Design a binder for this molecule. Sequence first.
Ligand SMILES: CCOc1cccc(-c2nnc(N)s2)c1
Ligand SMILES: *[C@@H]1O[C@H](CO)[C@@H](O)[C@H](O)[C@H]1NC(C)=O
Length: 341
Amino acid sequence: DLRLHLLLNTSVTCNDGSPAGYYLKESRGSRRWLLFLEGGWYCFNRENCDSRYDTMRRLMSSRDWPRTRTGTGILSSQPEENPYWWNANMVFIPYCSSDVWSGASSKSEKNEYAFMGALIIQEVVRELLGRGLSGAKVLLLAGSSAGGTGVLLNVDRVAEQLEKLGYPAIQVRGLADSGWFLDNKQYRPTEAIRRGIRYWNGVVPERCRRQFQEGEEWNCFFGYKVYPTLRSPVFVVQWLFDEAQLTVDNVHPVQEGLRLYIQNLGRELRHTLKDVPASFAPACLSHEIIIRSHWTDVQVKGTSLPRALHCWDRSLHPLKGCPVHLVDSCPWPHCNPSCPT
Ligand SMILES: CCOc1cccc(-c2nnc(N)s2)c1
Ligand SMILES: *[C@@H]1O[C@H](CO)[C@@H](O)[C@H](O)[C@H]1NC(C)=O
């Protein structure tokens, strides 16, 4: 169980002005820290944010949050559930900003909602330094779905923040799960992200912003475009046939047209990962994995995800029998026998 702490700086808020926060389980004998970003889509104007507030309110407010949460998957402390980092200090950061963790805008007389995702991450890091993070050797910023995209948008800013605060020896790294999307042709959101950035006062990494420039910052929400601009090591986990990708593409006895569409999506995803040295991409139809209790079950080329992450750790000190780049080559969902049922 991880215990809730609401942020002492009450100007850093969820969508409705209530305080943001984090859940924490400390491990006194460890210098590794795992900060996980929750996912859950986003909203991009007054009307669809109002709808979200009616029936997805825990993603917009802390008023009804429970005081504890059970750590699962990579946030579990049991070695049998989490062979990778079971003895680490564990942090779960709830997603209550509806902005893919990019926003920097307060609620005010002209803004019905606050969008403070980028500032929530910075404030969590600041307040954790007084609770033991000042002694860390590695800070892994991880996340799933919108939280995986949030890793890509924020990992280098966390590294810069710790450098400027006088902690140049903490190694900052990223783990992006199910946040690597393609701005492809639909079978039957670039615009929704463009509108969202203006609504949220969204911020993107500096080098990516300089490449694409004003009005085109939406490009930096797409992994294959923002990843080459990053300096921190990032490990990319992505199902080749991601369900959120297919939903946006308007895909739901498969005939030739849809067969070719689905095979081309897998091929394109594989192509964007060809030069990503730390990656895990199985040929499955699914969505998210790293905080699932059965995350230990899937394998690519005989290597599990916890093993690949451990091999990544060793590489940051090629390794015999300890691979870090694992991408399936077979071209149809569930051609990998270990896919989630
Ligand atoms: C942060 C990006 O989020 C997503 C997620 C899933 C799909 C898409 C898109 N698909 N087709 C497009 N033209 S954009 C974007
Ligand atoms: C509180 O958070 C706001 C928003 O990021 C920031 O401008 C301010 O400096 C913070 N105050 C303190 C005391 O940390």
